[PDB]
Write a protein that binds this ligand. Structure first.
Ligand SMILES: CC(=O)N[C@@H]1[C@@H](O)[C@H](O[C@@H]2O[C@H](CO[C@]3(C(=O)O)C[C@H](O)[C@@H](NC(C)=O)[C@H]([C@H](O)[C@H](O)CO)O3)[C@H](O)[C@H](O)[C@H]2O)[C@@H](CO)O[C@H]1O
Ligand SMILES: CC(=O)N[C@@H]1[C@@H](O)[C@H](O[C@@H]2O[C@H](CO[C@]3(C(=O)O)C[C@H](O)[C@@H](NC(C)=O)[C@H]([C@H](O)[C@H](O)CO)O3)[C@H](O)[C@H](O)[C@H]2O)[C@@H](CO)O[C@H]1O
Lengths: 30, 247, 290, 237, 237, 247, 290, 30, 50, 49
């Protein structure tokens, strides 16, 4: 919980489960 | 006011706590996010990229010679070429890999590995190998007829520069753990061995010794738990110019 | 294709394959990783895999509070001390490169955008023992290149516009969040160039990526006895976006100013031998004896 | 299908036909800088075919004791053609790159080339605390040679350099690598004379070997800048 | 109804007819490992009737000064039949057990047998700080003998061992005990050569006594593995 | 901010407090729950399992001999065979039972007990016993005609290897308590006695002495309150190898 | 049949039974406990039983915070102390077996799955008296087998990725929850086997069931006088699932490495006499005298 | 009350009154 | 009462914090706002004057 | 092999089924006892207790 006026003040955001490993494992075009 | 009481753990600084803290600069507007290529949101994305195994971690193999295995024509059949120890939490051919270095920030790991071997002889070089994964239990297999009883792929590198040996996750437990004990039933993954399935057979104007580059990645069933400091970096002093940050 | 991944993937059962056509054999030379599934390599069972992937989230992987600065100084009368000594105050240009555990973790990426949560632990030791003073310290955030104080009772400590935090040793550690401050959209963890228009500038150091300065004094006048005051600064990156992963540092770090390398004298992590040696390529290092 | 490849940019064309399916770096294609990411407010010059075209560098001799070669971008191209003139007459620069690395030999030759494009390859020096100088880093069109390519001259590792956008030239399989690089910087544009966004590294992981007639085997680097923008027009520096 | 019992597994059958209503351990019947609990991703071999069948051990002589007998599972069966071959050729193991303990005597004999299956019977040694070695624990088909069965050789108690899955062979009432054991491990499968999930303990709480003609009274242990799975096929260890 | 004030009890560590505390490992995913047989959710499940009474807690009864009562043929009628003290909170034949050991983690207890006796003679052994529960008040009954005035079961062990003597909860108070006073009106449960109802009558080729194994469990009206440290385990030193955890 | 039980069961009234057929006489030999109800044994009344059963819940029975570690060490200058001594810091492999009250309670089960709430109490005593220093301590959680620090000012205390808690002696006790950490779905309280592929491993010890390491230093530099610093670690299991109950430990524990037994010299809790002796089986031990 | 992001951080769960004592008292089949 | 615990940063005086604080004069009524010419709400208004 | 375990306490009789386990549809006599077309295998009895 955040009672500060700046949004950077908040706790860490451990909620981003989006992965795109294919930009490193398949960076090929065909 | 509000009747309160302090719990145990009041005033402590846990380095893994997760709290909001006071803004040092109020009304600071950070620089607008620009799209940058190659964003990583989860370290398992890195761990699935195949990277070179240092299978030739021997003396006289100097620097870059350690990242390839030279195979030669043999005059006996079924011959062992190389073997690979499989604990990614330990030092060995898997340690300085993308799967190895990220895993050694962790203690617990699950999931299949892939081993990709690229044959780097000439076009005229022909031959068949058998790449065997042996689940743990006993000693590393030294003969071909013992190792092919485990998980294996047979690879003609005639037109085919690469194959993949999937090392499937075959464990009693959900995770395998590092505890600084290589022979532990909670740790040991078993063995990868390579044998001449036929022979490296080159003509006179090909180089008679050919090289294999081995890769390892993790698959997407791979998981890492229990984050720890890495044993791969360390210091016993301050670095150079670190004092200059105080001047 | 980008997708939300909260658990590791399930294994589907598979059968016997004997097919003349589509391939366990891929193309390394394209730069692509093998897409060979275990279903296609061996004969598998169905496994519903419930293993979470949240601990390898880059936010969790990097939002550990790590020691970034550790400075001891004498808290005493400094009428007759050397001009090198921290005379009841030190300044510190905030870097992430002095302590190698955080340095190697942040140098796993090329670009990092994070807010810096700064935690300040102060310990005091008497230089006979009469007790420990509950001292007030001032930590003043000063921008890169700006004016830092030159003595303990400097009039730069008034902080008309600089942010200062006052904190006591008996208190919990002082804690501030420094925002993502860079003039760019990310910090450059590695900077392949000079950040100056002449050819005499420093290589590898972009001052855009410098957070700023911690100017830490003791607010108290000196006691009749001397004290050693150790200030430890902890940084937790948070709200982290990370770009372009890199090979990890293998050789020992030599400096904080650059990526210079020496290696250790022998394997492991030597210049010509990163992994420790075994006897031959067919020698198994921890072979089970039966 | 993966082998045949045709690369037409401007008046330049490349047909490679022993290729191995080109690398788009991080799955990202070069674009012009959009208005919601733009910073410099003057109208940029986008020279199109005058700069977005293949620039062939000097070839390097692939030899037995070779360690590796590197070229830094845009620095390898900052004095070539109309790209170099737009670099020298403008403060700001932004482009992508199409790197095409060429090396063939016989079917009796062996050898593997890690052709890898490294973003922000901050080079370390060996066995010293002094940072590399301007002359060690800014080689231009000639490029440099790896000192210790096993740690990529920065104390890391050749072995994990496949995390970067790369292809291989295995002399069995292919004779050309093709990496498509987008803009790779924390800033939208950049001053091209003091900062290198990409380093093309070309490294002998498996050395050149044969028992047939010894010929000079060269490695030829053709680099096409892609979607060039130039802001801050002034006199030539 | 409770006395009559017929146990057919594979090619093996047991008709006991002085039984006392068989124990299903914790009310749990053996099953194969389901997909939502599975860990090892290779397809297991489930040999069915080749392994899921009664294995009779060597009989032990119930004598006047006997203390007790124990067999550890799967260790008592790891070298018997096609169960032992699947154990020796696979890294992983999972099965349940059907234990059938057989001991009859005359209607003039007295004696009570606590037949108890102990999960994770970590044996303690007596009068020493040194842990029991491999040879003290891994007896195989012969099994071991209780040293101090009154504390179950682990400093606890015979008296509270009825908390474990057990039956009694009271020579008045019955001549056979039957315990059905499921998989009992913290892990889904296990390496069968270094870990024992169950210990069958057979203990003379009331000793064998009679005043008729003294005959050798044996205790015969027949163990059927149930729902065998084996993962991690390789060479024989 | 919020006006607060600290209450008495602020900063204390009560070992029985019930609070959330800081996660040492953020985003740790514990190993998936697997079904394991025999889950216990409440310790009264264990306490209802019958376990052997050590009724023969005498000298010369060595080890396993203490868990059976030898009965013999007698030549006088109505004879006492054994008695059992009934305070489960005390040391005696009930202490090392599942009902006894769990109850001695507690101070207060309510509810009925069951005593099951298994006759372990021969098939040819016949006889009748009377198992009497006497509610407390006076001395333990020594003659049969005094003890059968209380709660009793009469047991022919001819074909019947077992009976149950329910010791019903007969107390003035809702609970009985331990206070280290066996003769207390808040503690004493009364007595269990066994008498020859007829005689142990065996033929010549049966063993002339037969054994009884006694069990005790709790019923499901059983309750335990006021949790305390167990008097059944203790230490006055550190254990062996406990120092090795610091090395 | 599984059911929700919040109170002990009611007693129903019963009458006189005189029946030729269905049975107070059960079958022990089946391994089943007697199902004889008091309604079937004596002539009962109706009792509405309102006695709660919540205090014997396994969660309540085991979520007591219990002393698991108690380590004193000298807080002083350790230039000239022995190489055995804790030189301002100790490490502790977390076990539940060193203190016998918690050990016997946890060894009532075969399998336990719990989160470990770790509470750390620090007391300090002067080794003349000048007052007690409000010292900062670092407790760093290190995994099983991982690198622990070797001195007080080790660079392993920087905690780039290890969790550390900093806490002061004047503060409330440091409190952390360690999760359920095992690679298995439960801890094995007893492990009938070897956790290694060779035959020389330790019996009874599965390192999967080891929580980890508490590496506890004093962050402060040493004072001019010496102090004895006693650190007490408390563990409260929570979110407890328990499986397969066992006979309780009767004999005294000998070691923490195993279940070795000696017994006491005489009854009670001797090798051959667990319960204290009475004179005969017909001797009543606390017979009321009238 | 729990303001931590991990569910294991919470207080003890003293609310599970489900009993199945018959798996220990009646582990028989008939 | 309320179970609480103090965070790191408890008791600190950051000079850029933003909190309500205790009124030294309760029920003080400030002087009514009068319109004054030339109000500046943002310092960039000044910075745009040549 | 195929077995039945028989308590002859109250049970005067059991049956051992010798199941037809042959490669061929029939077994033949040819005056050769050890022939693969002839030999049925063995019945043995052991003291179980
Ligand atoms: C601790 C144990 O059980 N056995 C020790 C042996 O492992 C050791 O043999 C040496 O082990 C070395 C291990 O490699 C690493 C590691 O711990 O993983 C590799 C790390 O990258 C490296 N870290 C850094 C910062 O360089 C680390 C470090 O060098 C060591 O911790 C320093 O002690 O080592 C490696 O494989 C060696 O080649 C191998 O000989 C033996 C010594 O022979 O000691 C055992 O106690
Ligand atoms: C305290 C009191 O009112 N009377 C004492 C007598 O009880 C005592 O007689 C001895 O009592 C012993 C009690 O048995 C236990 C117990 O307290 O329940 C059994 C426990 O399992 C045992 N604990 C351990 C860790 O071994 C415990 C322990 O031995 C004692 O507390 C040590 O003192 O004893 C037991 O029945 C003896 O056989 C009996 O003689 C007399 C001494 O004769 O002292 C009275 O003060």
């Amino acid at each position: 919980i955040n009672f500060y006026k700046d949004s950077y003040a908040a706790s860490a955001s451990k909620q981003d489960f989006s992965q795109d490993p294919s930009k490193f494992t398949e960076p090929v075009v065909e | 006011g509000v009747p309160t009481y302090l719990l145990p753990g009041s005033g402590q600084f846990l380095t893994t706590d997760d709290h909001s803290s006071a803004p040092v600069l109020p009304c600071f507007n950070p620089t607008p996010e620009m799209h940058i290529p190659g964003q990583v949101r989860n370290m398992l994305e890195v761990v699935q990229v195949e990277s070179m195994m240092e299978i030739n971690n021997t003396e006289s193999a100097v620097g870059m010679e350690r990242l390839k295995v030279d195979i030669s024509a043999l005059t006996d059949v079924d011959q062992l070429l190389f073997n690979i120890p499989l604990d990614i939490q330990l030092d060995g051919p898997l340690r300085n890999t993308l799967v190895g270095n990220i895993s050694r920030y962790y203690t617990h790991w699950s999931g299949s590995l892939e081993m990709t071997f690229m044959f780097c002889g000439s076009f005229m070089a022909t031959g068949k190998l058998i790449l065997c994964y042996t689940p743990p239990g006993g000693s590393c297999p030294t003969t071909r007829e013992t190792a092919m009883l485990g998980t294996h792929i047979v690879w003609d590198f005639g037109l085919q520069s690469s194959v993949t040996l999937i090392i499937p996750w075959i464990s009693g437990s959900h995770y395998r753990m590092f505890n600084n004990d290589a022979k532990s039933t909670n740790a040991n993954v078993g063995y990868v061995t390579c044998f001449m399935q036929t022979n490296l057979i080159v003509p006179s104007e090909s180089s008679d010794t050919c090289s294999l580059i081995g890769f390892i990645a993790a698959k997407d069933d791979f998981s890492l738990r229990l984050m720890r400091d890495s044993p791969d970096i360390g210091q016993i002093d301050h670095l150079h110019a670190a004092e200059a940050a105080y001047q | 294709i980008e997708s939300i991944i909260k658990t590791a993937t399930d294994t589907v059962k598979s059968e016997i394959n004997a097919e003349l056509g589509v391939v366990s054999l891929n193309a390394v030379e394209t730069g692509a990783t093998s897409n060979t599934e275990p279903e296609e390599a061996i004969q598998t069972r169905t496994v519903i895999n419930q293993h979470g992937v949240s601990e390898t989230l880059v936010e969790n992987f990097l939002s550990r509070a790590a020691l970034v600065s550790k400075r001891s100084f004498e808290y005493k009368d400094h009428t007759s001390s050397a001009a090198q000594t921290d005379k009841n105050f030190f300044k510190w240009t905030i870097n992430t490169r002095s302590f190698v555990q955080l340095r190697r973790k942040l140098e796993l990426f090329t670009y990092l955008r994070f807010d810096a949560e700064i935690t300040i632990l102060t310990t005091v030791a008497v230089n006979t023992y009469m007790g420990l003073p509950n001292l007030t310290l001032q930590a003043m955030f000063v921008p890169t290149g700006a004016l830092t104080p030159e003595k303990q009772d400097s009039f730069h400590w008034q902080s008309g516009s600089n942010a200062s935090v006052f904190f006591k040793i008996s208190d919990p550690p002082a804690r501030m969040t420094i925002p993502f401050m860079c003039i760019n959209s990310a910090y450059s963890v590695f900077y392949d160039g000079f950040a100056g228009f002449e050819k005499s500038g420093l290589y590898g150091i972009n001052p855009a990526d410098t957070i700023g300065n911690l100017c830490v004094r003791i607010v108290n006048e000196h006691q009749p006895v001397g004290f050693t005051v150790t200030v430890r600064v902890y940084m937790k990156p948070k709200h982290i976006k990370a770009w372009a992963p890199r090979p990890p540092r293998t050789l020992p770090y030599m400096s904080i100013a650059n990526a210079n390398y020496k290696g250790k004298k022998r394997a492991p992590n030597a210049l010509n031998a990163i992994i420790g040696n075994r006897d031959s390529v067919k020698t198994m290092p921890h072979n089970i004896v039966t | 299908s993966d082998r045949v490849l045709q690369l037409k940019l401007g008046n330049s064309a490349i047909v490679t036909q022993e290729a191995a399916n080109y690398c788009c770096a991080y799955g990202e294609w070069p674009n012009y800088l959009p208005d919601h990411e733009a910073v410099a407010i003057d109208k940029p010059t986008q020279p199109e075919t005058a700069t977005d075209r293949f620039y062939t560098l000097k070839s390097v001799k692939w030899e037995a004791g070779s360690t590796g070669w590197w070229w830094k971008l845009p620095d390898a191209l900052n004095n070539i053609g109309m790209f170099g003139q737009n670099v020298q007459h403008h403060y700001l620069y932004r482009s992508g790159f199409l790197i095409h690395v060429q090396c063939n030999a016989t079917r009796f030759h062996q050898g593997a080339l890690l052709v890898v494009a490294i973003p922000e390859h901050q080079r370390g020096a060996h066995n010293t605390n002094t940072s590399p100088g301007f002359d060690d880093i800014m080689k231009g069109e000639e490029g440099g040679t790896f000192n210790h390519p096993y740690v990529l001259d920065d104390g890391t590792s050749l072995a994990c350099a496949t995390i970067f956008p790369h292809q291989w030239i295995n002399l069995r399989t292919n004779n050309s690598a093709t990496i498509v690089l987008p803009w790779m910087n924390a800033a939208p544009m950049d001053f091209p004379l003091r900062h290198n966004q990409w380093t093309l590294a070309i490294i002998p992981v498996v050395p050149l070997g044969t028992r047939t007639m010894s010929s000079m085997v060269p490695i030829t680097v053709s680099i096409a800048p892609m979607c060039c923008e130039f802001n801050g027009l002034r006199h030539a520096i």
